[PDB]
RNA sequence: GGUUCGUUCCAUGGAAUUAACGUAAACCCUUGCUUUAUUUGUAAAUAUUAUAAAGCAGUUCACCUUUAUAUAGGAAAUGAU
């Protein structure tokens, strides 16, 4: 006897060990050599290492004898690879460099040089566009830290129109007033 | 005339990237070295359990903070310099990247690379080798001093300094009740 | 008076008696091993009578602050000493108000 | 707050101690109507 | 430059929508008793599932989650800060817990399982583990032969700790550890 | 000591009190007041080069700074607070005063704080699904099969861990042999 | 052979075999399990409780510390602001408001959550945006006009050292001093407001708060679009308003309430109950025998043996196109991502995640003011005012009948209660506030 | 004017139509059942005590009686459960 009962495997017609193998190879066939190449050409190197190991760890015989469907309240409501980090539905990424301790807020002299440096970087790629001027008030650091873009701890914002919230409100205020 | 133009479509799309975020990369990485420091400090026969108990002792000397190798590299330079210099106590860095951030944050501050030789033996002596001082068996009940050391050596509540405070007053009393 | 720290170190609710019970917990921490050697020599009936009489007289000369029975838990938010809960360092009341707001983790109103 | 005003005081940032600043305003108001504290006596009563 | 019709998805992703697979123990001798605790169930119940998924990849056959008897503390406090004692109300603190037992698990492998769980611990859960290991006679010798083996593994770990020459603030080393472990623990 | 007095001696001396052009600025700078001799040569070559250009070139400069002054004119204008204002009713900082035009309107782009606790709980379920799809499989490369103890392994020690927590009971070692 | 002790733990095998039973009874959907972090401020469990008895007291210290951190402002001398040295107490409202922190404790770190309403950025951004676009364009011409007059001969190069740049940099400032101080003034004030949420300044606050929990603290600051979505920020805004002696108490409540927009509702349908019927679309009712050995064994469908295909018929797959189709992978520094990360469309995923969140829309509001809020400086009886807009009930349970999960056994999951205490020149007063979610 | 444990519900009024709180609902413990889990609990075991997560369940059906025909109630160890 094993840890599990064969009651569920004997009714379908998998009483024998050789019968369970015909089901695994038919239902849980391993990836073909062609699929691996295509799968290794789309995903990066590191992501492929975890895939090849999972197909060796998770043997197909386990999925047949004891594999069941997940119905718990913690199952993910959708299917996704979770390969990258998405804007809203994922925690904000932190890939910046640590801040400088000796950094200080620029002065009128240092501020001018930074403003001059910004005017020469955009004049090397009329004049400054609205996107460059808008990327200077929100991304140009005014600290003596070599224009560091520190990782923000601000939680990711929500979509422009949240599902379940949009389409239900009317603005009582009137511009004519 | 005080009118402000509504946010343009270009500007809206730009703010989204900052607020909502962008599609960054993610690289899986998991090796025993990335798990070293979070393991259980157990005195097993497996070297992994003993290497973790030594890492734990370095954290008690460093201040006792947990081994957090995923919450950044910042720290307190003004306080680590005082502890490392004005108090002359050790300092524990969860990673080398955190060690170089305090260097680039202080004006001419030098942090020793590694501990000294003796400090490495004192850690392996008790945390890894586990060398104790067997409490001897006292037969006669009149052996006051010997009997006290027996009890003080069989419990971690009495520290080396507390036992000395005890033995100081005890020996003072025994000597004051003689002819 | 001699045990009161010249520089206040208490970070909780400060009081006249909270500042007095804190000075006793520190004075007892320093003299506990010494005070436990006098109580051991007094109870050891194997030592000479004079040895036990000298320890009995020296224990009586210890300052009151050194005595551990003088220590009494006090609320870290109100400073009272009556009806204090050891698990929260607060009065029965301050525990209630904080438990309802959600400041005490785990505590919930009980119904059964 | 006094240890926060010194950590950010090197960057030129300021912050009002709403508690202490309020305690000082209450004392100043009393001196306006002659209700403050008396001169601390530092000698035996005689 | 063509399209390949994938027959199925990676097994790693398909295993996330099935119940946590479990390995079969040949002998059934416990090698670890991990007991999780929390004041809520949605994080405890969830982490218990995540733990079983890690014990399958490591070959550790896990058994559980076994729901242990919940611990209930009770306090009855007066609703008023004064004379009004005739009106009281009951409070409590229910501790919900589980138990994941690992049988026939390699000692070192179990420590990886436990290390992986602490790094990715779910907020609001307290974990306690008891590890069982077999050993031969003569522990004194064994613990002495493995001094050099541990020195080679710590060669690249000594960088964490750094101190001035002839540390004077520590004084008595063994006494420093004892009283510095109390401060961190909170007194005992 | 004594009753506290106000601290009114707080001010930042502006470098220049009025806009100076290259000529006037260099002239005042090169008044032989206090500077290195060699350093005074740099300014001199600059001033000499400044007084070598056509008048029109100099004229344009004078108008260029006046075109910048008008570009930053609406940024130093004291906006008058609205009659029925809510935020700037007692705001003594003229700078922050805006028009209060559509500043408190709901654009249907946010949920309540209670909803952010369930959304932040999903951002964590993905963080744990990303670990169980990409990082857990790598744990199988370092696992070792269990081997039953031989006839010489007669002891069964027990060690307790609290997973990164200091508990005084984490020092006991139980041993049981037959 | 085997050890005698290794055999005494094998014989103790009375385990119960997993039955894999077949469900014959219909199952209803589970309740809405609210977040755990909203029940208690500290979501923690420690095996040694000596690290748990101070948390209620630290909270006050932390909240007061974080409150003062979001109020940090430059010294007027640093920005050449010509401070007005008045003896009055300015009551400023255009600052960053914060809520009571909510900490998620672990043995390794602590995640400190705080909801803010950045009211300073709303003004600084719009004002600095008034600066014409020609300013930067005309300023770029001065950099080219000064590199042909001062750093040239007759009307970056190897014969131009950095010594000449120092003097060349002052002339521009000599003629644009009063202009650069203005731009720099708003640029710094915006960056300060921006760095309070980034690591450039949070690493300094982490140290001060790290001395209480003895752990590295991670922040999850959340930005709110309107201040009416959090009771902590709302009761603090109304409190600062009433601190003035001339504040019209009753009229300030009407302005705040009028700024609260409630969604349209069908009264008859909102209060209508739900009948209990078996939902045969539930994953538990669809397949009553969850064993894959029975679902994939040609039960009803044909040639769907593949497990992946089955999952696609139950969950929305993002990788595939057309919701149901097939996965087509292309055949044979830069970021390490997939070759289809851009093709993935999270249009319906956003609609699945935000529909499973309850109490999103604000449906209730209640403001209570009680205390000494008179004008004249004399002894006068207390004042009490109450206003509300919408209901604070739990509609899912009060009308429909669905089971809810009360917080701490007595509180409704959808209501946020907060109290703020202040004082006038004549006495103390409080401001309570309830905000509810539909 | 009837009805209901209840401003519950129906009808009706030459003035009504509605909202919030309380009520109600829901929740916690408890009861039967279904599924999950089997240690530190259980003699054995193919699992039935215990432990505890979620879900279902009632006045529902049957019988009898019933106004203005609109709203319903009774019976209680010998209908089911
Ligand atoms: K000892
Ligand atoms: Mg009527
Ligand atoms: Mg057992
Ligand atoms: Mg049962």
Cα separation values, G367 from C110, E78, G410, G430, Å: 29, 28, 21, 11
Q: Name the helix (H) or strand (E) containing G420.
A: strand G415-423
Q: Tokens in use for F135?
A: 């990082």
Alpha-carbon Rg of chain E, whole angstroms?
A: 24
Closest CA relative to residue A142, chosen from G156, G139, G203, D12:
D12
Match 């019927």 to its residue by tokens: G277
What is the rounded distance in angstroms from the CA atom of residue C104 to the CA atom of residue C95? Answer: 8
User: Which candidate in B28, B56, B70 is best for mutational testing of the F interface (most F CBs within 10 A)?
Assistant: B28
What is the rounded distance in angstroms from the CA atom of residue G106 to the CA atom of residue G275? Answer: 43
State the distance from the centre of ligand 4 to the C-alpha of G16, rounded, in angstroms: 15
Is the torsion defined by CA of G217, G223, G228, G234 positive or negative? positive
What is the rounded distance in angstroms from the CA atom of residue F35 to the CA atom of residue F45? Answer: 15
Q: Is the CB of G28 under 7 A from strand H?
A: yes
What is the rounded distance in angstroms from the CA atom of residue B85 to the CA atom of residue B72? Answer: 24
Query: Are the CB atoms for F66 and G126 separated by under 8 Å?
Result: no
SS3 B24: strand
Beta bridge partners of B91: E162
What is the rounded distance in angstroms from the CA atom of residue G66 to the CA atom of residue G99? Answer: 9
> How many Cβ atoms from other residues are within 10 Å of residue E24's Cβ?
14
Cα separation values, A25 from A61, A64, G311, Å: 9, 10, 19
Kindly give, in sequence order, each residue whose CB lies less than 8 Å from that of residue G7, ignoring residues fewer than 6 positions away. none
- Structural biology method used: cryo-EM
* DSSP structural state of residue G296: T
User: Which candidate in E12, E13, E111 is best for mutational testing of the B interface (most B CBs within 10 A)?
Assistant: E111
Q: What's the CA G84/C1' H49 distance, rounded, in angstroms?
A: 81
What is the rounded distance in angstroms from the CA atom of residue E116 to the CA atom of residue B34? Answer: 9
- Determine the nucleotide nearest to G273 by Cα–C1' distance: H25
Per DSSP bridges, beta strands C84-85 and E62-63 are unpaired
Q: Name the helix (H) or strand (E) containing E139.
A: helix E139-145
What is the rounded distance in angstroms from the CA atom of residue B52 to the CA atom of residue E110? Answer: 14
Q: Name the helix (H) or strand (E) containing B55.
A: helix B47-62
Minimal Cα distance from A34: which residue of G?
G331
Match 């709303």 to its residue by tokens: G122
Inter-chain CB proximity A37 and G200 less than 8 Å: no
**In Å, how far is C8's CA from the nearest CA of chain G?**
17
Closest CA relative to residue G212, chosen from G318, G33, G54:
G54
Kindly give, in sequence order, each residue whose CB lies less than 8 Å from that of residue F5, ignoring residues fewer than 6 positions away. none
Q: What's the CA G268/C1' H10 distance, rounded, in angstroms?
A: 19
SS3 E120: coil
Is the torsion defined by CA of G41, F126, G228, G399 positive or negative? negative
What is the rounded distance in angstroms from the CA atom of residue A49 to the CA atom of residue A54? Answer: 9
Query: Are the CB atoms for G257 and A29 separated by under 8 Å?
Result: no
What is the rounded distance in angstroms from the CA atom of residue G316 to the CA atom of residue G338? Answer: 20
What is the rounded distance in angstroms from the CA atom of residue A3 to the CA atom of residue G20? Answer: 12
The 8 Å CB, 24+ separation contacts for C60-66 are: C62/C31, C62/C35, C63/C3, C63/C27, C65/C3, C65/C23, C65/C24, C65/C27, C65/C28, C66/C24, C66/C27, C66/C28, C66/C31, C66/C35
**In Å, how far is F123's CA from the nearest CA of chain G?**
10
Is the torsion defined by CA of A64, A69, A70, A76 positive or negative? positive
Query: What does the H/E/C string look like for A33-78?
Result: HHHHHHHHHHCCHHHHHHHHHHHHHCCHHHHHHCCEECCCCCCCCE
Per DSSP bridges, beta strands G216-219 and G109-113 are parallel
Q: Tokens in use for A29?
A: 């066939």
Within residues 46-65 of protein chain E, the ones with CB less than 7 A from nucleic strand H are 63-65
Nearest ligand by distance to the CA of B152: 1
Q: Tokens in use for G70?
A: 């979001």
Chains that touch D (3 or more CB pairs under 8 A): A, G
Inter-chain CB proximity A41 and G330 less than 8 Å: yes
* DSSP structural state of residue G190: H
User: Which candidate in E7, E124, E180 is best for mutational testing of the G interface (most G CBs within 10 A)?
Assistant: E124
Query: Are the CB atoms for F168 and E185 separated by under 8 Å?
Result: yes
| Burial environment of residue G264 by CB neighbours within 10 A (0 to 12, 13 to 18, 19 or more) | exposed
Query: Are the CB atoms for E179 and E187 separated by under 8 Å?
Result: no
What is the rounded distance in angstroms from the CA atom of residue G312 to the CA atom of residue A78? Answer: 9
Cα separation values, E138 from E133, E143, E146, Å: 15, 9, 13
Q: Which residues of B17-29 are buried (b: 16+ CB within 10 A; e: fewer)?
A: eebbbebbbbebe
Query: Are the CB atoms for E99 and E34 separated by under 8 Å?
Result: yes
Strand segments, DSSP code E, in G253-321 are 316-317
| Upstream peptide bond of E65 is cis (omega within 30 degrees of 0) | yes
What is the rounded distance in angstroms from the CA atom of residue F33 to the CA atom of residue E9? Answer: 81
Q: Is the CB of A68 under 7 A from strand H?
A: no
Match 């583990």 to its residue by tokens: E129
What is the rounded distance in angstroms from the CA atom of residue F74 to the CA atom of residue E32? Answer: 72
SS3 F15: coil
Match 């050292």 to its residue by tokens: G161
**In Å, how far is D18's CA from the nearest CA of chain A?**
26
State the distance from the centre of ligand 3 to the C-alpha of G12, rounded, in angstroms: 7
- Determine the nucleotide nearest to E33 by Cα–C1' distance: H39
Q: What are phi and psi of F53, to 5 degrees?
A: -105, 160
- For A:63-122, CB contacts with G below 8 A are 63-69, 71, 73, 76-81, 83-84, 86, 88-89, 96, 98-99, 103, 105-106, 108-109, 111-113, 115-116, 119-120
Cα separation values, E125 from E37, E74, E96, G409, Å: 6, 21, 10, 20
Inter-chain CB proximity A90 and F134 less than 8 Å: no
SS3 B136: coil
Instruction: Show the DSSP H helices in B82-178 as ranges.
Output: 96-103, 117-123, 144-152, 160-175
Is chain D adjacent to chain G, meaning 3+ CB pairs within 8 angstroms?
A: yes
Instruction: Show the DSSP H helices in chain A as ranges.
Output: 7-10, 17-27, 33-42, 45-57, 60-65, 108-121, 130-137
Kindly give, in sequence order, each residue whose CB lies less than 8 Å from that of residue D27, ignoring residues fewer than 6 positions away. D36
Alpha-carbon Rg of chain D, whole angstroms?
A: 17
What is the rounded distance in angstroms from the CA atom of residue F87 to the CA atom of residue A50? Answer: 55
- Determine the nucleotide nearest to E65 by Cα–C1' distance: H37
Strand segments, DSSP code E, in G332-371 are 362-371
Query: Are the CB atoms for F97 and F78 separated by under 8 Å?
Result: yes
Resolution (angstroms) stands at 3.1
Q: Is residue C39 less than 8 Å (CB to CB) from chain B?
A: no
The bases of strand H with some atom under 7 A from any protein CB are 18-29, 33-47, 51-57
What is the rounded distance in angstroms from the CA atom of residue E145 to the CA atom of residue E123? Answer: 40
Per DSSP bridges, beta strands G428-437 and G415-423 are antiparallel
Q: What's the CA A77/C1' H26 distance, rounded, in angstroms?
A: 27
Residue E114 region by backbone torsions, left for phi larger than 0, else alpha for psi between -120 and 50, else beta: alpha
Closest CA relative to residue G206, chosen from F119, B105, E187, B75:
B75
Closest CA relative to residue F65, chosen from F26, F17, F14, F22:
F22
Angle at G252 between CA G248 and CA G253, to 5 degrees: 125
State the distance from the centre of ligand 3 to the C-alpha of E106, rounded, in angstroms: 20
Query: Are the CB atoms for G148 and F61 separated by under 8 Å?
Result: no
What is the rounded distance in angstroms from the CA atom of residue B11 to the CA atom of residue A132? Answer: 11
Closest CA relative to residue F85, chosen from F71, F69, F103:
F103
Closest CA relative to residue G353, chosen from E38, E12, A168, A156:
A156
Query: Are the CB atoms for F46 and G150 separated by under 8 Å?
Result: yes
Strand segments, DSSP code E, in C1-109 are 84-85, 90-91, 108-109
Nearest ligand by distance to the CA of B155: 1
Chain G residues with CB inside 8 Å of E66's CB?
A: none
Q: Number of C-alpha atoms within 13 angstroms, CB side, residue A1?
A: 10
> How many Cβ atoms from other residues are within 10 Å of residue C36's Cβ?
16
What is the rounded distance in angstroms from the CA atom of residue G251 to the CA atom of residue G241? Answer: 11
Question: Could you tell me how many residues make up chain C?
Answer: 112
Largest CA distance in chain A: 85
Chain B residues with CB inside 8 Å of G336's CB?
A: 25-27
Residue F32 region by backbone torsions, left for phi larger than 0, else alpha for psi between -120 and 50, else beta: left
What is the rounded distance in angstroms from the CA atom of residue E123 to the CA atom of residue A1? Answer: 40
* DSSP structural state of residue E70: P
Instruction: Please tell me which of the candidates A38, A67, A79 has its beta carbon nearest to residue E18.
Output: A67
Beta bridge partners of F157: E133, F175
Inter-chain CB proximity A63 and G136 less than 8 Å: no
What is the rounded distance in angstroms from the CA atom of residue F152 to the CA atom of residue E52? Answer: 32
Query: Are the CB atoms for C111 and E90 separated by under 8 Å?
Result: yes
């Amino acid at each position: 006897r094993s840890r599990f009962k064969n009651v569920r495997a004997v009714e379908m017609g998998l009483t024998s060990d050789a019968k369970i193998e015909s089901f695994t190879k038919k239902k849980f066939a391993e990836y073909t050599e062609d699929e691996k190449a295509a799968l290794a050409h789309n995903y990066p190197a590191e992501h492929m290492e975890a895939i090849e190991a999972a197909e060796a760890a998770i043997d197909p015989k386990d999925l047949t004898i004891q594999g069941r469907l997940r119905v718990d309240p913690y199952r993910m409501p959708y299917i996704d690879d979770f390969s990258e980090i998405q804007p809203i539905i994922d925690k904000r990424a932190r890939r910046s460099a640590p801040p400088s301790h000796k950094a200080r807020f620029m002065d009128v002299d240092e501020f001018t040089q930074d403003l001059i440096n910004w005017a020469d970087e955009i004049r090397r790629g009329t004049g400054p566009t609205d996107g460059d001027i808008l990327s200077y008030i929100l991304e140009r650091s005014s600290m003596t830290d070599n224009n560091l873009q520190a990782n923000s701890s601000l939680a990711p914002a929500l979509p422009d129109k949240v599902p379940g919230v949009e389409g239900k409100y009317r603005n009582a205020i009137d511009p004519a007033d | 005339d005080d009118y402000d133009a509504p946010p343009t479509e270009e500007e809206k799309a730009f703010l989204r990237g900052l607020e909502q975020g962008k599609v960054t990369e993610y690289v899986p990485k998991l090796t025993p070295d990335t798990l070293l420091g979070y393991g259980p400090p157990v005195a097993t026969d497996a070297a992994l359990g003993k290497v973790e108990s030594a890492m734990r002792t370095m954290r008690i000397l460093g201040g006792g903070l947990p081994f957090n190798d995923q919450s950044g590299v910042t720290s307190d330079p003004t306080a680590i310099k005082h502890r490392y210099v004005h108090e002359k106590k050790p300092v524990f860095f969860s990673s080398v990247e955190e060690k170089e951030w305090v260097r680039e944050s202080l004006d001419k501050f030098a942090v020793s690379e590694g501990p000294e030789k003796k400090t490495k033996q004192k850690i392996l002596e008790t945390s890894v080798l586990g060398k104790y001082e067997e409490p001897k068996y006292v037969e006669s009940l009149t052996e006051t001093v010997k009997m006290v050391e027996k009890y003080q050596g069989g419990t971690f509540s009495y520290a080396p300094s507390d036992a000395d405070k005890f033995n100081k007053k005890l020996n003072q009393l025994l000597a004051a009740g003689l002819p | 008076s001699m045990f009161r720290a010249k520089k206040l170190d208490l970070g909780c609710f400060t009081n006249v008696r909270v500042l007095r019970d804190h000075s006793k917990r520190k004075a007892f921490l320093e003299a506990e091993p010494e005070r436990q050697a006098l109580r051991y020599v007094i109870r050891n009936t194997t030592l000479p009578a004079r040895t036990r009489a000298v320890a009995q007289l020296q224990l009586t000369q210890m300052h009151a602050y050194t005595r551990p029975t003088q220590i009494r838990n006090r609320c870290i938010l109100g400073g009272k000493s009556r009806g204090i809960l050891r698990d929260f360092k607060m009065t029965r009341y301050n525990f209630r108000m904080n438990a309802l707001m959600g400041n005490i983790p785990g505590v919930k109103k009980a119904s059964w | 707050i006094r240890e926060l005003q010194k950590e950010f005081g090197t960057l030129g940032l300021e912050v009002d101690d709403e508690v202490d600043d309020d305690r000082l305003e209450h004392l100043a108001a009393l001196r306006a109507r002659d209700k403050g504290a008396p001169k601390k006596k530092r000698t035996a009563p005689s | 430059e063509q399209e390949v019709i994938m027959s199925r998805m990676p097994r790693s992703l398909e295993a996330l929508y099935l119940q946590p697979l479990r390995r079969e123990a040949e002998y059934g001798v416990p090698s670890c008793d991990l007991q999780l605790r929390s004041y809520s169930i949605r994080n405890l119940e969830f982490f218990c599932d995540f733990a079983l998924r890690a014990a399958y990849y490591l070959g550790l056959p896990a058994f559980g989650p076994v729901p242990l008897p919940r611990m209930i503390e009770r306090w009855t406090v007066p609703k008023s800060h004064f004379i009004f004692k005739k009106s009281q109300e009951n409070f409590e603190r229910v501790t919900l817990r589980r138990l994941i037992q690992i049988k026939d698990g390699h000692p070192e492998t179990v420590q990886l399982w436990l290390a992986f769980l602490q790094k990715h611990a779910y907020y609001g859960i307290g974990m306690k583990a008891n590890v069982w290991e077999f050993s031969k006679l003569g522990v004194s010798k064994a613990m002495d032969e493995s001094k050099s083996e541990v020195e080679k593994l710590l060669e690249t770990r000594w960088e964490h700790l750094s101190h001035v020459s002839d540390m004077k603030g520590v004084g008595n080393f063994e006494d420093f550890l004892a009283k510095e472990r109390l401060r961190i623990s909170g007194g005992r | 000591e004594g009753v506290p007095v106000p601290k009114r001696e707080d001010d930042a001396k502006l470098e220049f009190t009025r806009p100076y052009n290259p000529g006037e600025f260099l002239s005042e700078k090169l008044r032989s007041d206090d500077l290195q001799d060699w350093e005074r040569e740099r300014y001199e070559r600059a001033l000499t080069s400044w007084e070598q250009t056509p008048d029109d070139l100099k004229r344009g400069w004078s108008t260029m700074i006046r075109d910048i002054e008008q570009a930053a004119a609406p940024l130093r204008r004291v906006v008058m607070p609205r009659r029925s204002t809510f935020w700037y009713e007692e705001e003594k900082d003229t700078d922050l005063i805006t028009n209060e035009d559509g500043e408190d309107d709901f654009h249907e782009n946010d949920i309540m704080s209670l909803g952010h606790g369930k959304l932040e709980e999903h951002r964590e379920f993905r963080e744990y699904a990303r670990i169980a799809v990409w990082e857990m499989p790598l744990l199988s490369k370092y696992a070792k099969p269990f081997v039953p103890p031989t006839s010489e392994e007669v002891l069964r020690f027990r060690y307790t861990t609290y997973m990164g927590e200091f508990h005084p009971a984490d020092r006991k070692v139980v041993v049981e042999f037959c | 052979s085997a050890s005698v002790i290794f055999s005494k733990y094998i014989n103790n095998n009375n385990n119960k075999l997993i039955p894999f039973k077949i469900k014959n009874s219909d199952l209803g959907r589970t309740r809405y399990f609210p977040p755990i972090s909203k029940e208690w401020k500290n979501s923690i469990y420690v095996f040694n409780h000596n690290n748990l008895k101070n948390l209620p007291l630290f909270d006050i210290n932390i909240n007061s510390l974080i409150k003062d951190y979001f109020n940090l402002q430059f010294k007027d001398k640093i920005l050449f602001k010509k401070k007005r040295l008045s003896k009055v107490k300015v009551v400023s409202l255009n600052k960053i408001y914060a809520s009571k922190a909510e900490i998620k404790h672990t043995n390794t770190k602590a995640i400190l959550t705080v909801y803010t309403f950045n009211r300073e950025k709303i003004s600084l951004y719009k004002k600095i945006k008034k600066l014409k676009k020609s300013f930067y364009f005309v300023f770029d011409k001065i950099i080219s006009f000064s590199e042909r007059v001062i750093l040239s001969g007759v009307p970056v190069l190897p014969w131009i050292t950095e010594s000449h740049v120092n003097i060349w940099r002052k002339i521009i400032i000599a003629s644009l001093y009063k202009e650069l101080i203005l731009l720099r003034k708003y640029k710094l004030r915006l960056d300060l407001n921006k760095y309070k949420f980034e690591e450039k300044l949070l690493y300094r606050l982490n140290n001060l708060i790290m001395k209480y929990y003895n752990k590295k603290v991670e922040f999850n600051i959340v930005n709110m679009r309107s201040f009416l979505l959090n009771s902590d920020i709302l009761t603090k805004i109304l409190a600062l308003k009433l601190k003035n002696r001339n504040a019209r108490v009753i009229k300030i409540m009407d302005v705040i309430l009028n700024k609260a927009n409630l969604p349209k509702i069908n009264r008859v349908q909102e209060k209508a109950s739900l009948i209990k019927s078996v939902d045969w679309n539930l994953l538990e009712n669809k397949f009553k025998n969850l064993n894959l050995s029975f679902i994939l064994n040609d039960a009803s469908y044909a040639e769907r043996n593949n497990l992946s295909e089955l999952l696609n018929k139950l969950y929305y797959n993002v990788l595939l196109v057309s919701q149901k189709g097939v996965w087509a992978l292309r055949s044979p520094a830069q970021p390490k991502v997939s070759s289809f990360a851009k093709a993935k469309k999270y249009a319906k995923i956003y609609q699945i995640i935000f529909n499973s969140i309850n109490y999103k829309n604000m449906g209730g509001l209640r403001l209570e003011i009680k205390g000494r809020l008179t004008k004249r400086y004399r002894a006068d009886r207390s004042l009490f005012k109450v206003k509300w807009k919408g209901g604070l009930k739990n509609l899912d349970s009060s009308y429909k009948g669905l089971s809810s999960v009360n917080m701490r056994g007595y509180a409704k999951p959808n209501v946020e209660y907060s109290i703020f205490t202040s004082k006038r020149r004549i006495g103390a007063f409080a401001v309570k506030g309830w905000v509810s979610g539909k």
